């Protein structure tokens, strides 16, 4: 017997009973089709199976089992407005949900780490089949996620609510827990979800994504100079010596009064083109392009490109000048685009896409919960208008978190052309 409070939330709960039902059906249809297709695509392709993309298959299977189990039960619960499944199902569904969120966050972390290790080596030789250590990684990811979900199976049980005469059974984390550790988990449930299942995955993925993109940049500027110098060879020793020459060059840029303001203005890609000109003719020579450097600082790419075209540097070496100038105008690596640079652009866009989708889907829920414990008080007479506002955001946050179970296959379709052809070929079959 636990009666509810006032008026405001009742009309909103009824309004969202239809919204949540629509979102649940969309996530179910889009999720069971996208994740099943993605699982088939990853494993059947031998060139993705022997790499870090097998972790995306683990991510897809984790969402897939969450879709088929949690979504239909939650739809039945919303429509019936009562829990009619018994005690066993009241413990299974939260356990399945908690394990799925753990599989998602641990597969995302392992993918960003493996993608960093993949770009940290020259001439890496892939094996045949799933790597043995990646298999241990996936097993451990699922083992840890199940163990961390055991409290949900222990704590959840059915209670009876008294709504001014009407009795309705509710499945929730029981306020009275049997053991001291289990009662502590009831108080720190939301903080534990925010710390381990949001702050930890974001901190690790963004850290290794930064390391991966920095390493991609030092290799792109490496191949950029070797292409412009006619050719060369890669390797850790060759890159280490080349990075020292680049670091010594930028130290001369930052001491030069003419090149310091324009270099700080440019982005990482356009800074590589300025470094290229320094490698070719020295800093005293690059500082002579006073008009062009001013236009680059004012971010007039077309005007600076035209002004650089009418120069002795352009006439003597047209081919190299056109590529360096194109890099200034576009700000991309299109003039030096090869199989290596195109591979790194594909990797960087997919990893950044999955992490961003995960962060945007779970940000409203946690943001709505911090507003509940920093702005709400039971005493205040004006709580029902404020409670009315807080419940809307929490419902929005619950729906946004459910969309993450179907957003990953769609996200890869729009960002990656490699997966887009794989999705079309799979559904054309």
Ligand X SMILES: CCCCCCCC/C=C\CCCCCCCC(=O)OC[C@H](O)CO
Ligand Y SMILES: CCCCCCCC/C=C\CCCCCCCC(=O)O
Question: Which of these segments, 138-146, 213-221, 237-245, 341-349, binds ligand X (CB under 6 A)?
Answer: 138-146
Q: Which of 225, 255, 251 is nearest to 238 (CA)?
A: 225
Binding mask 158-197 for ligand Y (x = CB under 6 A): ---------------------------x--x---x-----
**Residue 102 lies near ligand Y (rule: CB under 6 A):** no
In the list 71, 101, 109, 171, the residue contacting ligand X (rule: CB under 6 A) is: 109
Question: Which of these segments, 136-144, 172-180, 249-257, 321-329, binds ligand X (CB under 6 A)?
Answer: 136-144
Q: What is the spatial distance between Cα 321 and Cα 304, in angstroms, rounded to a whole number?
A: 13
Q: What are phi and psi of 425, to 5 degrees?
A: -65, -35
**Residue 152 lies near ligand X (rule: CB under 6 A):** no
**Residue 151 lies near ligand Y (rule: CB under 6 A):** yes
**Residue 147 lies near ligand Y (rule: CB under 6 A):** yes
**Residue 397 lies near ligand Y (rule: CB under 6 A):** no
Complex with ligand Y: residue 52 or 155, whichever CB lies closer: 155
Q: Which does 204 bind (CB under 5 to 8 A by kind): ligand X, ligand Y, none?
A: ligand X
**Residue 188 lies near ligand X (rule: CB under 6 A):** yes
Other C-beta atoms within 10 Å of 106: how many? 27
CB of 114 to ligand X, least distance (A): 8
**Residue 2 lies near ligand X (rule: CB under 6 A):** no
Q: Which does 387 bind (CB under 5 to 8 A by kind): ligand X, ligand Y, none?
A: none
Q: What is the spatial distance between Cα 117 and Cα 112, in angstroms, rounded to a whole number?
A: 9
Q: Which does 185 bind (CB under 5 to 8 A by kind): ligand Y, ligand X, none?
A: ligand Y
Q: Cα–Cα–Cα angle for 324, 307, 260, nearest 5°? A: 65
Locate 103 and state its tokens: 């599989």
Locate 25 and state its tokens: 């059906």
CB of 360 to ligand Y, least distance (A): 25
In the list 68, 148, 193, 200, the residue contacting ligand Y (rule: CB under 6 A) is: 148
CB 322 within 8 A of CB 310: no
User: Helices 339-375 and 383-415: crossing angle, nearest 10°?
Assistant: 170
Question: Which of these segments, 67-75, 191-199, 243-251, 357-365, binds ligand X (CB under 6 A)?
Answer: 191-199
Q: Tokens 């054309």, residue?
A: 428
Alpha carbon distance, N-terminus to C-terminus of the chain: 56
In the list 57, 100, 115, 137, the residue contacting ligand X (rule: CB under 6 A) is: 137
Q: Which does 110 bind (CB under 5 to 8 A by kind): ligand X, ligand Y, none?
A: ligand X
**Residue 192 lies near ligand X (rule: CB under 6 A):** yes
In the list 25, 29, 139, 150, the residue contacting ligand Y (rule: CB under 6 A) is: 150
Binding footprint of ligand X, residue count (CB under 6 A): 15
Q: What are phi and psi of 160, to 5 degrees?
A: -105, 125
CB 100 within 8 A of CB 63: yes
Q: What is the spatial distance between Cα 141 and Cα 240, in angstroms, rounded to a whole number?
A: 35
CB of 304 to ligand X, least distance (A): 45
CA 163 to chain centre: 42
Tell me 199's DSSP state: I
| Residue 92 CB burial class (10 angstroms; 0-12, 13-18, ≥19) | middle
CB of 158 to ligand X, least distance (A): 24
**Residue 138 lies near ligand X (rule: CB under 6 A):** no
What Å distances lie between residue 375 and 300, 364, 389, 392, CA to CA? Answer: 48, 16, 11, 15
CB 426 within 8 A of CB 41: yes
Q: Tokens 């652009």, residue?
A: 345
Binding mask 362-401 for ligand X (x = CB under 6 A): -----------x----------------------------
Sites of contact with ligand X (CB under 6 A): 106, 109-110, 113, 137, 140-141, 144, 187-188, 191-192, 195, 204, 373
């Amino acid at each position: 017997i636990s009666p509810p409070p006032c008026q405001g939330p009742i009309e909103i709960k009824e309004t969202f009973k239809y919204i949540n039902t629509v979102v649940s059906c969309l996530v179910f249809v889009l999720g069971i089709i996208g994740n099943s297709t993605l699982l088939y695509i990853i494993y059947k392709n031998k060139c993705m199976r022997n790499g870090p993309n097998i972790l995306i298959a683990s991510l897809a299977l984790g969402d897939l089992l969450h879709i088929v189990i949690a979504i239909p039960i939650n739809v039945y619960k919303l429509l019936a407005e009562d829990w009619p499944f018994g005690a066993e199902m009241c413990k299974l569904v939260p356990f399945i949900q908690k394990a799925s969120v753990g599989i998602t966050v641990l597969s995302l972390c392992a993918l960003s780490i493996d993608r960093y290790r993949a770009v940290a080596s020259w001439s890496r030789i892939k094996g045949i089949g799933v790597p043995k250590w990646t298999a241990v990684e996936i097993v451990l990811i699922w083992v840890v996620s199940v163990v961390l979900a055991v409290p949900e199976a222990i704590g959840f049980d059915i209670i009876t609510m008294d709504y001014k005469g009407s009795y309705l059974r509710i499945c929730l984390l029981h306020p009275v827990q049997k053991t001291a550790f289990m009662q502590f988990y009831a108080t720190a449930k939301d903080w534990w979800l925010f710390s381990f299942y949001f702050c930890l995955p974001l901190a690790i993925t963004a850290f290794f994504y930064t390391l991966m993109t920095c390493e991609m940049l030092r290799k792109n500027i490496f191949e950029m100079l070797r292409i412009d110098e006619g050719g060369g060879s890669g390797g850790d020793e060759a890159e280490k010596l080349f990075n020292q020459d680049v670091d010594a060059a930028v130290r001369g840029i930052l001491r030069n009064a003419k090149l310091k303001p324009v270099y700080d203005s440019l982005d990482a890609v356009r800074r590589a083109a300025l470094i290229n000109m320094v490698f070719q003719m020295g800093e005293t020579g690059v500082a002579g392009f006073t008009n062009s450097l001013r236009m680059l600082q004012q971010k007039r790419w077309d005007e600076a490109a035209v002004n650089l075209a009418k120069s002795r540097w352009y006439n003597q070496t047209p081919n190299r000048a056109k590529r360096v100038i194109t890099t200034f105008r576009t700000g991309t690596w299109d003039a030096y685009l090869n199989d290596h640079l195109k591979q790194r652009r594909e990797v960087a866009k997919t990893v950044f896409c999955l992490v961003l989708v995960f962060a945007l889907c779970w940000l409203p829920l946690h943001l709505a919960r911090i507003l509940k414990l920093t702005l709400y008080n039971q005493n205040d007479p004006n709580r029902c208008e404020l409670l009315s506002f807080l419940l809307v955001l929490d419902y929005i946050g619950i729906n946004m978190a459910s969309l993450n179970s179907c957003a990953n296959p769609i996200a890869l379709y729009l960002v990656s052309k490699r997966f887009k052809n794989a999705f079309k070929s799979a559904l054309c079959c």
